[PDB]
Amino acid sequence: REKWSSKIDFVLSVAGGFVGLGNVWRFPYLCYKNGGGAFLIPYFIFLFGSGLPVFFLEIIIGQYTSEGGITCWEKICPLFSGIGYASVVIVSLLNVYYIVILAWATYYLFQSFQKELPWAHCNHSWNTPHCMEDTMRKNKSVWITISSTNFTSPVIEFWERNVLSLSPGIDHPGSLKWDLALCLLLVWLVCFFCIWKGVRSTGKVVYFTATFPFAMLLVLLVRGLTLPGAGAGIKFYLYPDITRLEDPQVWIDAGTQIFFSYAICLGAMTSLGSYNKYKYNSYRDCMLLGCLNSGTSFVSGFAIFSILGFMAQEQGVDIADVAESGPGLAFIAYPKAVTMMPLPTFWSILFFIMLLLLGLDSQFVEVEGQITSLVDLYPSFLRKGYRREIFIAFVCSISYLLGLTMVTEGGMYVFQLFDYYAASGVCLLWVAFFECFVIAWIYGGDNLYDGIEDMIGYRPGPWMKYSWAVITPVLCVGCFIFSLVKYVPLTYNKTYVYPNWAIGLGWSLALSSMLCVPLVIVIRLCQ
């Protein structure tokens, strides 16, 4: 019922909504898991094919219908309202597992206040006799003679035991960790208190909050590019291997990284664009913001892969045999980088503060989008007041209780299963394909273009029309069929095999989001 007070608020909110952990943490290890470069080819293809057109489509639908995640599809096609519900389920699961990264970040922040960084060396109560210094790991006298593969690094050991304490498998949950639960509770309390008061933006602090992360990223890039072995990392990151293009995995994990980074199919963008003025030019902004996001991801990829190549040269092993083919890549690369900056504790605190800022503002945007998408369903009941406040309290408490399962001794396997099935992969393809299909073949590209021209002042080019019509559905169907034809089970890191019931649980997680689309159709057609 309210609009933006000024047009800078919309730009700042959208800039803080889709820039964060998906550009600095998830993109690097997805690039690292595959060859690199062979991941970039489908990335840019998917970018210019679907990433920008669907984002602009969501913004235009929000601006043209003046509604949220679910109700927007009611003014387009009532039969396909299940896309909103699927988006809400996806964003709920994402909210559940996405704050554990912030919990690890605040655990590192609290551990950073010591005079000496704990992960710099290994002289501790949780170190194997196999540990050796990263500087001393590559030595022709003591390491290359024997036990080359048995050795491990202090950073990896810290991440595996002190923070994670890995159990032998998912079948052995172990005991609960109380400090991580406390950190999770603290982050959830901060998130709840920032919505109690409805604090949004500032007067003379936004130009600090939105510019400090970029300055920190610039310092990180300058540090990384000046380290030995950065050229090998850049070559690994850029030059593609044509053989890997025949594996469905790279094609399916390159087209979903973009859908994750641009916050597509979550219901957040169709609500962010709702408060805009009717006669406002959003094309230029959608283009500039997409350019900013993709450039940030590409530059951060340079920054992380430089130090990755440096570490691989330092340990004297293969590029693919360092760090982790999983969610722990950032928490191994970045701390190793800040270990060598002057005054390491200060830069460590600054880096974890900016990481928390990037994660939190996104968390705020996604929680706000979920709450809006919910309250447009029931305005009278979820009227502003105490009811809406206890609603947020209940949602936060339930999400904390569910996320407790990832802080046990076997929570890492649950976390990897969630990352791979919950709010990524095939469900994103499902919802994106249905969105593009319903908007291009049921509603009409020309019919939309008339609305844009009425709202923007001129007729746009036919690029997005032909994108929505053919380019995105073809890719979405091809990737899905190609993955089904050649099936490969998920493996955590590289040497681990999941039990069959765990894979069944993951497929149930994905199908919980998928089946919203056909069940709503059969329910509506029943009566």
Ligand X SMILES: N=C(N)NCCS(=O)(=O)O
Ligand Y SMILES: *[C@@H]1O[C@H](CO)[C@@H](O)[C@H](O)[C@H]1NC(C)=O
Ligand Z SMILES: CC(C)CCC[C@@H](C)[C@H]1CC[C@H]2[C@@H]3CC=C4C[C@@H](OC(=O)CCC(=O)O)CC[C@]4(C)[C@H]3CC[C@]12C
Separation of alpha carbons 500 and 172, rounded Å: 15
Report the nearest approach of ligand Y to the CB of residue 339 (Å).
Answer: 18
Q: Which does 380 bind (CB under 5 to 8 A by kind): ligand X, Na ion, ligand Y, none?
A: none
The two structure tokens encoding residue 208: 């600090």
Can residue 370 be called a binding residue for ligand X (CB under 6 A)? Answer: no
* Three-class SS of 316-349: CCCHHHCCCCCCCCHHHHHHHHHCCCCCHHHHHH
Q: Where do we find the tokens 């669907």?
A: 54
Among 31, 132, 263, 406, binds ligand X (CB under 6 A): 263
* 177 contacts 408 by C-beta, under 8 angstroms: yes
Among 87, 294, 315, 362, binds ligand X (CB under 6 A): 362
Report the nearest approach of Na ion to the CB of residue 210 (Å).
Answer: 9
Can residue 261 be called a binding residue for ligand X (CB under 6 A)? Answer: yes
The two structure tokens encoding residue 299: 């530059």
Instruction: Give 211's DSSP letter.
Output: T
Q: Where do we find the tokens 């993955």?
A: 483
Instruction: Give 441's DSSP letter.
Output: I
Report the nearest approach of ligand Z to the CB of residue 516 (Å).
Answer: 5
Q: Would you call 152 helix, strand, or coil by DSSP?
A: strand
Pick the stretch among 41-49, 171-179, 261-269, 373-381 that binds ligand X (CB under 6 A): 261-269
| Other residues' Cβ atoms within 10 Å of the Cβ of residue 234 | 18
The two structure tokens encoding residue 195: 């919505």
Separation of alpha carbons 167 and 408, rounded Å: 9
Q: Which is nearer to ligand Z, 38 or 83 (CB)?
A: 83
The two structure tokens encoding residue 486: 């050649």
Pick the stretch among 27-35, 81-89, 129-137, 477-485 that binds Cl ion (CB under 5 A): 27-35
Return residues touching ligand Y (CB under 6 A).
Answer: 123-125, 139, 141-142, 147, 149-150
* 50 contacts 472 by C-beta, under 8 angstroms: yes
Among 10, 13, 14, 18, binds ligand X (CB under 6 A): 18
Among 102, 254, 258, 266, binds ligand X (CB under 6 A): 266
Pick the stretch among 113-121, 191-199, 246-254, 260-268 that binds ligand X (CB under 6 A): 260-268
Q: Which is nearer to ligand X, 120 or 357 (CB)?
A: 357
Spell out a b/e string for 476-514, using b for 16 or more CB atoms within 10 Å of the CB, else e: beebbeebeeeeeebebeeeeebeeebeeebeebbebbb
What amino acid is encoded at 502 in this protein? A
* 314 contacts 308 by C-beta, under 8 angstroms: no
Separation of alpha carbons 100 and 404, rounded Å: 9
Can residue 257 be called a binding residue for ligand X (CB under 6 A)? Answer: no
Report the nearest approach of Cl ion to the CB of residue 258 (Å).
Answer: 6
Can residue 94 be called a binding residue for ligand X (CB under 6 A)? Answer: yes
Can residue 108 be called a binding residue for ligand X (CB under 6 A)? Answer: no
Can residue 29 be called a binding residue for ligand X (CB under 6 A)? Answer: no
Return residues touching ligand Z (CB under 6 A).
Answer: 85, 88-89, 92, 96, 374, 378, 381, 395, 398-399, 402, 508, 512, 515-516, 519-520, 523-524
Report the nearest approach of ligand Y to the CB of residue 342 (Å).
Answer: 23
Can residue 297 be called a binding residue for Cl ion (CB under 5 A)? Answer: yes
Q: Which does 395 bind (CB under 5 to 8 A by kind): ligand X, ligand Y, ligand Z, none?
A: ligand Z
Rounded to a whole number of angstroms, the CA Rg of the chain reads: 23
Q: How many residues interact with ligand X (rule CB under 6 A)? A: 12
The two structure tokens encoding residue 161: 């035991």
Q: Which is nearer to ligand X, 256 or 348 (CB)?
A: 256
Can residue 374 be called a binding residue for ligand X (CB under 6 A)? Answer: no
Q: Which is nearer to ligand Z, 420 or 449 (CB)?
A: 420
The two structure tokens encoding residue 315: 């340990």
Among 13, 23, 467, 472, binds ligand X (CB under 6 A): 23
Name the nearest CA neighbour of 367 among 88, 8, 180, 72.
88
Separation of alpha carbons 28 and 39, rounded Å: 11
Q: Which does 176 bind (CB under 5 to 8 A by kind): ligand Z, ligand Y, Na ion, none?
A: none
Q: Which does 149 bind (CB under 5 to 8 A by kind): Cl ion, ligand Y, ligand X, none?
A: ligand Y
Binding site for ligand X (CB under 6 A): 18-23, 94, 260-261, 263, 266, 362
